[PDB]
């Protein structure tokens, strides 16, 4: 049972910079037949993995020249030169020299880019939903960086605690930004007890927080 140690777990890298992923085996990956069966895959968010590098240093078909592998014996590197937004994902080394083939734990390549402010939108409950007995209010923070963002819900100007849920996309593979939904879920009765609904957003991109709101039945 050889172990494949892949470092680091996450690698932040700027656009156009070089990224280096190390993969280490507890025993030599040189097969007594002379070959070294060490390979690299990349799995982009949502997708199946894609073949990238075979036998240490050969690029699979269609793989750009900015990807190269090196190393011998027990120590291997994957270098991505001049990093591009599309390169985002989890990189896995994979050995098939020894029975049984194994993957490394993966390295999540993440892009650093300049701060970008969110665009903010609020959505009242649909009537279809109200007449089913519940009410969700949805606040969208679109296309921002970094990931850290604060969303506060105010209902008739009172701060809400623990009745909303956040969800964040993966980094966009074109502009490396994130988006985020915050959802406030109330029962229809509770929803109709109040008039003004607002999310306030705080973020590194905004010089001061941005509030989006609506008045129920607007």
């Amino acid at each position: 049972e050889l172990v494949m140690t892949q470092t680091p777990l996450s690698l932040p890298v700027s656009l156009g910079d070089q990224a280096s992923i190390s993969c280490r085996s507890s025993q030599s990956l040189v097969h007594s037949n002379g070959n070294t069966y060490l390979h690299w895959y990349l799995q982009k968010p949502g997708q199946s993995p894609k073949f990238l590098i075979y036998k240490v240093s050969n690029r699979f078909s269609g793989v750009p020249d900015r990807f190269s592998g090196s190393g011998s014996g027990t120590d291997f590197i994957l270098k991505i030169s001049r990093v591009e937004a599309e390169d985002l994902g989890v990189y896995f080394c994979f050995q098939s020299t020894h029975f049984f083939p194994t993957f490394g734990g993966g390295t999540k390549l993440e892009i650093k880019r300049t701060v970008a402010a969110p665009s903010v939108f609020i959505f009242p409950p649909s009537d279809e939903q109200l007449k089913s007995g519940t009410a969700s209010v949805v606040c969208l923070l679109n296309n921002f960086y970094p990931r850290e963002a604060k969303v506060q819900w105010k209902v008739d100007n009172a701060l809400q605690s623990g009745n909303s849920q956040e969800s964040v996309t993966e980094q966009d593979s074109k502009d490396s930004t994130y988006s985020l939904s915050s959802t406030l879920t109330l029962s229809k009765a509770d929803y109709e007890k109040h008039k003004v609904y607002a999310c306030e957003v705080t973020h590194q991109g905004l010089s001061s927080p941005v509030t989006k709101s609506f008045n129920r039945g607007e």
């Binding site: 049972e1 069966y37 390979h39 895959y41 799995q43 199946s48 993995p49 894609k50 073949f51 075979y54 036998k55 699979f60 896995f92 994979f94 098939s96 049984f100 083939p101 194994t102 993957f103 490394g104 734990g105 993966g106 665009s119 939108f121 609020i122 959505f123 009242p124 409950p125 649909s126 279809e128 939903q129 089913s132 969700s136 949805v138 969208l140 679109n142 849920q165 956040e166 969800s167 964040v168 996309t169 988006s179 939904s181 959802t183 879920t185």
Partner: protein, 219 residues
């Protein structure tokens, strides 16, 4: 080109059996191995084993000896993975991947099949419109979407205008509520001028419950 198309998502009670299929096309089926790979949610990739279509023999990794089997239907160029006596640890996405034996590597992979092992029955989502932020006659861009609420299990697939609308779409990761059910939103940004003329439909498909829905979203 080489294509590996897997069957759809499955929900199964613990102790049941599941068979997953992987239809190959675009190459000589028997001349390449078929590898199966497990990926538990948030976790790394695990090689399960492979079957040799040329000799019909299977080999498994140590963790996969026993409850696991690989079958072939050579005339239909299809490979199968069967798991019996299902357990919670089996909840995962399963990939077939073609083995190019000339370098001992998997080269093309299937899109993955999600299997959920659970005592609970499926629950289809309700779909609600998230109505456009602005009116047609104002400037800049508008956001609109669909709330896909209270379903089990994952995955749900959301598209816009039957795949014809792709740019500016953000489909959020599903989140659990205290009810034990998932919800998510899909949103899209569009020129607000186009709200007057373009129509926007979200197509939601939750296969485990046989729910397909098309919701028109407008002001």
């Amino acid at each position: 080109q080489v294509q590996l198309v897997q069957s759809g998502p499955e929900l199964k009670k613990p102790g049941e059996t599941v068979k997953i299929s992987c239809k190959a096309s675009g190459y000589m089926f028997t001349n390449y191995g078929m590898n199966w790979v497990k990926q538990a949610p948030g976790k790394a990739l695990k090689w399960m084993g492979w079957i040799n279509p040329y000799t019909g023999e299977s080999t498994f990794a140590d963790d996969f000896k026993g409850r696991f089997a690989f079958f072939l239907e050579t005339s239909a160029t299809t490979a199968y993975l069967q798991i019996n006596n299902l357990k919670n640890e089996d909840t995962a996405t399963y990939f077939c991947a073609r083995g190019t034996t000339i370098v001992w590597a998997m080269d093309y992979w299937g899109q993955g099949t999600s299997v959920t092992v659970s005592s609970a029955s499926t629950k289809g989502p309700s779909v609600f419109p998230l109505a456009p932020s602005s009116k047609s006659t104002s400037g800049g861009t508008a956001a609109l979407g669909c709330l896909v609420k209270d379903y089990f299990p994952e995955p749900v697939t959301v598209s816009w205008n039957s795949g014809a609308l792709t740019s500016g779409v953000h489909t959020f990761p599903a989140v659990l509520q205290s009810s034990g059910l998932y919800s998510l939103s899909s949103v899209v940004t569009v020129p607000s001028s186009s709200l007057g003329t373009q129509t926007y439909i979200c197509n939601v498909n939750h296969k485990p419950s046989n729910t397909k829905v098309d919701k028109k979203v407008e002001p």
